[PDB]
Amino acid sequence: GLAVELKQSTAQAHEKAEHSTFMSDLLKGRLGVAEFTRLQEQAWLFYTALEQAVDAVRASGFAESLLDPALNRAEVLARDLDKLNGSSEWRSRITASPAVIDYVNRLEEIRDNVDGPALVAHHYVRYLGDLSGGQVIARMMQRHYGVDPEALGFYHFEGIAKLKVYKDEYREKLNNLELSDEQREHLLKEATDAFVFNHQVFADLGK
Amino acid sequence: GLAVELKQSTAQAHEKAEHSTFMSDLLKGRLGVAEFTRLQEQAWLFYTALEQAVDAVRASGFAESLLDPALNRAEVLARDLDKLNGSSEWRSRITASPAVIDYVNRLEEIRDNVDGPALVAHHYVRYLGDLSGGQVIARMMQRHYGVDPEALGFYHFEGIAKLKVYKDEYREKLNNLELSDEQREHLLKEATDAFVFNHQVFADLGKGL
Structure with missing residues (x-):
């Protein structure tokens, strides 16, 4: 289904974004x-x-x-x-x-065109990352740098009690989203773009 | 016949049009x-x-x-x-x-001179381009930019059942146009001009992107 194709389709961009020097060093x-x-x-x-x-x-x-x-x-x-x-x-x-x-420009264009498929792509990339890799980031900010978890509320999601259940249900919803062939291609195109945008954000941080 | 000569005559200008940086990036x-x-x-x-x-x-x-x-x-x-x-x-x-x-000025001159041959050249360049590659462009605009299919009415011909048969018949109509040598040559030259105009349209659109 879509969740799987989504992961597979974005695999290259995702790996590149994850392995930014800035994020790796942080x-x-x-x-x-x-x-x-x-x-x-x-x-x-x-x-x-x-x-x-x-x-x-x-x-x-x-x-x-x-x-x-x-x-x-x-x-x-x-x-x-x-x-x-x-x-x-x-x-x-x-x-x-x-x-x-550039990333804000895309998100604003998505908002302006009320582009549903595009928005879902960008939502998956950021929030699913937060609920997974973001959890590692929070733990490490405290362990490596002594950040007080009071300044890590970003990684805590209220009234989401169990992350694994949440992520499984998210992907089930993706699998059940009704999309035309073109909308689904668009969602996939945008998800790759979303990873690349984030990789470039990390690249600028490192400079 | 004419439809074949048109294709060959305009192949250099045609490829340049299609391969503009604006259209490529688009x-x-x-x-x-x-x-x-x-x-x-x-x-x-x-x-x-x-x-x-x-x-x-x-x-x-x-x-x-x-x-x-x-x-x-x-x-x-x-x-x-x-x-x-x-x-x-x-x-x-x-x-x-x-x-x-410039493109509009030429079209307006063709209007006011009621220049049949030159008009047919411009008709061929635009509409046979629309009939032939419009579906590819429409598909790309949804894939890449999420464009509402309802805002791609340009790439849909309501009056036309099947695009394949239509294009074939269009080419046959070209072939069946009674034209003098002077008219045919005027048309062919015009068709290259039309491709050039469109290329220049794309060039303008791409400035400063």
């Missing part, structure tokens, strides 16, 4: 809180755009059961950022890196 | 729905001028059966642009790019 303990905070500030910019697209697409009636509002991260993340930066200073300091500009 | 999924919409806005301009020239030549009694009104794209295209842009706004925003200006 997770193995070679960086620090500062780099983690820079990541989270860029994430706040793109999650903000992502969830506007998600809100438009859910409102349109497409893929409603996938687009669980419990996954919303922008608000939790800003609080994480207030804690990492010691204040709301970051709101008027931060600016999208070149890669983040 | 078809590979490197641009976005905005770029598609820009394309269609420019197309609305030249199809409008094309179909005025068609109307004129048809009314004159020249190549009547070839100049099938079911081929008309301007109105269908306006409806596509209404859906793509989300309002009627575009009708007053849009303006011809430099190549579209």
Whole structure:
């Protein structure tokens, strides 16, 4: 079904995105809180755009059961950022890196065209990653860098009690999403793009 | 016959048109729905001028059966642009790019001279391109840019049951056009010109992407 084809179709881009030097170094303990905070500030910019697209697409009636509002991260993340930066200073300091500009552009175009298939692609890439690789990131930020889990609420999802069950039901919903052949090709194309966008975000972080 | 000569005559200009950087990037999924919409806005301009020239030549009694009104794209295209842009706004925003200006000026001259042979060249370049490769382009616009199939009315011919039979019959109509040597040569040269105009349209669309 789609969940499987989705994983297989994105496999190359996904592996490339996972093995970014910046993300590899962050997770193995070679960086620090500062780099983690820079990541989270860029994430706040793109999650903000992502969830506007998600809100438009859910409102349109497409893929409603996938687009669980419990996954919303922008608000939790800003609080994480207030804690990492010691204040709301970051709101008027931060600016999208070149890669983040391109990624936000796509998420805004998706929102504007109310592109359901495209949005689901981007939703799977970010949220399924959060519920899997993100959990490793949270554990490591605390272990390697001594980050207080109070500044790691981003990785904690309220009223999601069991991650494995959640991820299995997500993929079942994907498998049951009604899509034309063109919509399904579009979803697959966009999912590859989503991994590449994230890889470029990591690449800019490393520069 | 003529349909064969046209293909051979215009093969250099034709390939250059098809392989423009704008169309290449468009078809590979490197641009976005905005770029598609820009394309269609420019197309609305030249199809409008094309179909005025068609109307004129048809009314004159020249190549009547070839100049099938079911081929008309301007109105269908306006409806596509209404859906793509989300309002009627575009009708007053849009303006011809430099190549579209030249392309339209030629079409307008062909209209006012009621130049049957040159009109047929432009009809061939545009509509047989639409009939032949339109389905590929429409498929790519959904695959890459999520374009609503309802906003691809341009690539659907309501009046036409089967595209294969139609294209074959179109080529036969070309072959059956009674043309003098002077008319045939004028048409062939014009058909290369038409491919060049379209290439230049794509060039403009690709500037600064």
